[PDB]
Amino acid sequence: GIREKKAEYFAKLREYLEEYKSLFVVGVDNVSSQQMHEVRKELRGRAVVLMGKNTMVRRAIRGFLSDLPDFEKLLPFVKGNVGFVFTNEPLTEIKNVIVSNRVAAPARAGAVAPEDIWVRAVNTGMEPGKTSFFQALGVPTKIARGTIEIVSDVKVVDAGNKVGQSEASLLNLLNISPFTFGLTVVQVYDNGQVFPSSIL
């Protein structure tokens, strides 16, 4: 019975193509449902977020490419967890609304670092017992009456580089959040031609 179940979804994507003239293909990776749950709230009425599994979607376009052939450039850009934010309103205000949600989540395990962390001088307050992290990674520090003291800005990891388990676990109890969480606009489909979101 999945066929009639799947087909109804197939129709819903079809309709959005005609009336909505733009898209925001966004790299929504590493966002909670809770966080993404409020994302729907602000978008009320102005726009909508359409998403499905790429497997059916990429085929589904081909069936729609029969009459609307202007979707070739989408094919490479449809990879991973990506949402089609169809747009019938000025594109600039869309992203501004979208980028708003920027909850920095502290040292999320597994997450790839999006920022060149500058570890400025911070007195930890951490106990001597757990300091095994500190000694293992070098991290010149001094346990001053229990309170460890970060000396100076050192970039252990950089943007786009996975934080190693050692520092990743170490950074958690320090509660610094380099992992600003937000829907990451990669490209923008505009009236027949998808362009990188960077420009907009």
Partner: protein, 191 residues
């Protein structure tokens, strides 16, 4: 059901040469050469392009074709084992009694010596199997690095280190003392 023909592919990287007789596999790589006898498995190897070898069984039963995938895994371990190497990380677990472990030589035998295990006055002796290197890694408290070409020698000797430190006459659930492998990886980082 006696599958007519079952095939598996073993990938050969550029820097390795493999010479296999009837069942005697000789893999030659950057850090050494490893050998194994496969006379008990009754399989067929054949080249494809000198960078891919096919291992084949014709008329294989449910049990017989099961060993085919083993041979792929068993040989592939050498291919990555002579190129990228094997290292098992061990931590000691001790509540009160620190585990006194070091390297001692008796008649040139390179025995790993253990003292004071849970207050035990036995001196535990575990041989270091041929080819595995034993080293105490600093920057991590109570950690051993066990490395070598062959996964069989490194892992089994690693198990023998674990097996000699079983707690006796006691609640294993609370007296959690022992030496346990913490990580199973490759010696070369991200190679």
């Amino acid at each position: 059901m006696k599958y007519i023909q079952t095939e598996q592919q073993i990938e050969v990287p550029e820097g390795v040469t493999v010479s296999i007789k009837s069942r005697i596999v000789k893999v030659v790589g950057p850090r050494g050469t490893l050998t194994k006898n496969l006379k008990h498995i009754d399989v067929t190897f054949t080249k494809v392009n000198n960078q891919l070898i096919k291992v084949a069984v014709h008329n294989g039963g449910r049990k017989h074709v099961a060993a085919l995938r083993t041979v792929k895994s068993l040989v592939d371990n050498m291919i990555t084992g002579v190129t990228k190497g094997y290292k098992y990380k061990m931590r000691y677990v001790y509540a009160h009694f620190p585990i006194n472990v070091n390297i001692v030589e008796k008649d040139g035998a390179k025995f790993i010596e253990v003292r004071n295990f849970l207050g035990d006055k036995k001196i535990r002796n575990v041989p270091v199997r041929d080819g595995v290197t034993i080293e105490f890694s600093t920057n991590v408290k109570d950690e051993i690095v066990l490395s070598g070409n062959s996964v069989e020698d490194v892992s089994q000797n690693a198990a023998d280190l674990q097996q000699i430190c079983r707690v006796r006459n006691k609640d294993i659930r609370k007296f959690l003392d022992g030496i346990y492998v913490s990580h199973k990886g490759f010696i070369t980082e991200d190679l």
